Amino acid sequence: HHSSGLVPRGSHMGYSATAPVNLTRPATVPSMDGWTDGTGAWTLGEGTRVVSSDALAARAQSLASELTKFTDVDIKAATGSATGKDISLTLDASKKAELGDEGFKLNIGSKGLEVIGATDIGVFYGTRSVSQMLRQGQLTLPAGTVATKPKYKERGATLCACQINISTDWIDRFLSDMADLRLNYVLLEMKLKPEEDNTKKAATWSYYTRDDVKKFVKKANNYGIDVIPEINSPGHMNVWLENYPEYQLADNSGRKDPNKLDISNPEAVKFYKTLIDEYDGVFTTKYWHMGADEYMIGTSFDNYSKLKTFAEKQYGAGATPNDAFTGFINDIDKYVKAKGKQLRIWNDGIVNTKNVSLNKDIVIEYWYGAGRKPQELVQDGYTLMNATQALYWSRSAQVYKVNAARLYNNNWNVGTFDGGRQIDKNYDKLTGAKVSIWPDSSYFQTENEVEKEIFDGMRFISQMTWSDSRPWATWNDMKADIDKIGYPLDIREYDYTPVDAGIYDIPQLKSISKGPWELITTPDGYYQMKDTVSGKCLALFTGSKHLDVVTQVGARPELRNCADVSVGQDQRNTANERNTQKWQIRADKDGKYTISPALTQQRLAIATGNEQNIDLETHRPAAGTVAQFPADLVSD
């Protein structure tokens, strides 16, 4: 008896007329439905290039570099003639009928692996499938051809980077993941740091700087992603009106809510419009999302008779508070249209009116199925996006955890509106669908834990919005392929934990302890820092909060009994002590390290006394002590 003789097949690079008939075709997400099988197969190998026109050079260079990393083969970009050993990129704008604005074709055969798109984004999206097919350990691909384009125009996520801050590094990863998945839509509820003297008191954290937004919008756009801002109004306004009580709506007894804009006050409405004009400069999108959810949550219009008075003055006798509410939406619509934008709102903004009618040119993003039902809005001719609660995650609300298995197995599609209410999935004004990623009480899960949790659901929505098919017999078959496919390169490369666990001197922390400090890593990519003097661990635990997270600029860290940072998000009873003890360490360009509270995403710094922020007007940490600050205030 001899051994098995097991040896690597080791196929020659390029095309082979020979291939086994049932050689695996590596899976992609979205699936590429209706593959026509050809004869033979193609092998990426030594000498394989990505060849394109000059105009596509950047795309080709980026793909070659990526494939060199995934495959361990030296893959270079080139122009001119392609050979069978090569991947070719072609932009053919005459193919819009076949491929539309985002679709692509693959031809794999004796000419090599051709990717054709009718647009730059179409070519890019084809390259995503090439990357997915070649990064699963198999470098031979069955020959044949396929053409694919998305069923729906808008495919993506709501990312509420709201009250709490989602780090710009997280956002960059998220955009890379969306691009891999051919998702082209992110509604970003967020604060752009307000700078002019009618709005500047609202520069409380979370915020994003202009430069930061410009940077991730540029990244998004290169990936084919429309980044739509949202400033929710006239409800959910606390982060904007806390410092502007003059714009808050008072109830009949005179009690103001920082969450409610007074839409009867024209200076309040101008404040909102001023924000829109500030955002105009850094987002490129042609849309504005004003929210309009949950204005009267926890209460009722009966408690705000001044809105009835206003309605009657503004929109005539018999007008109701719902009329005034809808009139504010229509006024914002008029405003943003004049800037070249289309308005979007949440469906719970569609209320029963009398004197005023909602403008039909506003996109309705449908999440709440107790309102006006989906089929009714179809009958009326509104433009609809499916933002079902079935596709929500919350850090704190366990009612909101997407169950991709259940949706896959129960036959959900993009026409399945909230509460399992079906409309015709071919409705000609159905734009698409999206998952939604909400922080709510934010200490239960770190952003890195959110990243791990959303993985499956992001693949699910990608599949259902592009392909609208279930080529895997069950969800578990899908799951196995999505896991083989894995994350895109940028996620695999991100240095979550750039320093080794060990003992460190940290001079920035001398106001807390002379140290040294013992650092250990956590499963979610953070550190716990134990002071070897006291035996306690560093926490960012105390200060003013939004969403139960310390948002206070200039809050100081403290030593607390060491929490167990090795456990997962199911340990909800200890979450706050645990997550307030997690620290993100980042390396500079080049080589210096910054320490950030994992939950806050501010940066530790030594306070100079010259940092300028509204929070620091009324409390400053002692000068020279260590405290957290937004990165922009400590960028010195």
Ligand X SMILES: CC(=O)N[C@H]1/C(=N/O)O[C@H](CO)[C@@H](O)[C@@H]1O[C@@H]1O[C@H](CO)[C@H](O)[C@H](O)[C@H]1O
Start-to-end CA distance of the chain, whole Å, equals 73
Q: How buried is 517 (Cβ within 10 angstroms: 0-12 exposed, 13-18 middle, 19+ buried)?
A: buried
Between 152 and 367, name the residue whose CB sits nearer to ligand X: 367
Q: Which of 125, 367, 443, 504 binds ligand X (CB under 6 A)?
A: 367
* Minimum separation from the CB atom of position 389 to ligand X (A): 7
Least separation, in Å, of the C-beta of 239 and ligand X?
7
Structural contact between residues 216 and 168, judged by C-beta atoms closer than 8 angstroms: yes
Burial of 609 from C-beta contacts in 10 A (0-12 / 13-18 / 19+): exposed
Strand (E) or helix (H) holding 143: strand 140-148
- Does the annotation flag 293 for ligand binding? yes
The tokens 């089929």 sit on which residue? 375
Using CB under 6 A, which of 185, 205, 335, 392 touches ligand X?
392
CA dihedral of 325, 327, 328, 334, whole degrees rounded to 10: 150
Q: Would the annotation count 361 as a binding residue?
A: no
Q: Which stretch binds ligand X (CB under 6 A): 159-167, 495-503, 519-527, 575-583?
A: 159-167
Tell me: does residue 205 bind ligand X (CB under 6 A). Answer: no
Q: Is 293 in the site for ligand X (CB under 6 A)?
A: yes
Q: Is 272 left (phi over 0), alpha (psi -120 to 50) or beta?
A: alpha
Q: Is residue 551 part of the contact set for ligand X (CB under 6 A)? A: no
Among 149, 236, 260, 308, binds ligand X (CB under 6 A): 236
For position 347 contacting ligand X by CB under 6 A, the verdict is: no
Q: What is the DSSP string of 446-457?
A: -HHHHHHHHHHH
User: Whole-number minimum distance, CB 314 to ligand X, in Å?
Assistant: 26
Do the Cβ atoms of 263 and 323 come closer than 8 Å? Answer: no
Q: Tell me how many degrees the CA angle 277-206-223 measures, rounded to the nearest 5.
A: 65
240 lies in the site for ligand X, by CB under 6 A: no
Q: Binding site annotation covers 440? A: yes
Residue 400 interacts with ligand X (CB under 6 A): yes or no: yes
- Sole binder of ligand X in the list 162, 171, 186, 329 (CB under 6 A): 162
Taking CB under 6 A as the rule, does residue 163 contact ligand X? yes
The three state secondary structure string of 77-124 is EECCCCCCCCEEEEECHHHHHHHCCCCEEEEEECCEEEEEECCHHHHH
CA distance 165 to 227: 17
Q: By CB under 6 A, is residue 394 in contact with ligand X?
A: yes
Contact flag: residue 191 with ligand X (CB under 6 A):
no
The verdict on whether residue 232 carries a ligand-binding annotation is yes
Which segment (138-146, 436-444, 498-506, 562-570) binds ligand X by CB under 6 A? 436-444
Catalytic hit among 195, 196, 230, 294: 294
**Which H helix or E strand runs over 560?**
strand 558-560
* Subset of 307-346 contacting ligand X (CB under 6 A): 346
124 touching ligand X, by CB under 6 A = no
When the beta carbons of 112 and 235 are compared against ligand X, the nearer one is 235
Count of Cβ atoms closer than 10 Å to residue 108 Cβ: 25
Q: Using CA atoms, how far apart are residues 498 and 525, in angstroms rounded to an integer? A: 10
Q: Is 160 in the site for ligand X (CB under 6 A)?
A: yes
Determine, following the binding rule CB under 6 A, whether residue 242 of this chain makes contact with ligand X.
no
Residue 602 in the binding site for ligand X (CB under 6 A): no
**Integer Cα distance of 323 and 310 in angstroms:** 10
Task: Verify whether residue 518 is a known catalytic residue.
Answer: no
Nearer to ligand X by C-beta: 129 or 163?
163
Report if residue 232 touches ligand X, rule: CB under 6 A.
yes
Q: Does residue number 140 form part of the binding site for ligand X (CB under 6 A)? A: no
Q: Is 543 in the site for ligand X (CB under 6 A)?
A: no
Contact status, residue 77 vs residue 49, Cβ threshold 8 Å: yes
Amino acid at 71: T
Stretch that binds ligand X, among 158-166, 241-249, 522-530, 549-557 (CB under 6 A): 158-166
Q: Is 528 known to sit in a ligand binding site? A: no
Q: How many residues does the chain have?
A: 636
Which residues carry out catalysis? 294
Binding site for ligand X (CB under 6 A): 160, 162-163, 189, 232, 236, 293-294, 346, 367, 392, 394, 397, 400, 438-440
Bind-site residues: 163, 189, 232, 293-294, 392, 440
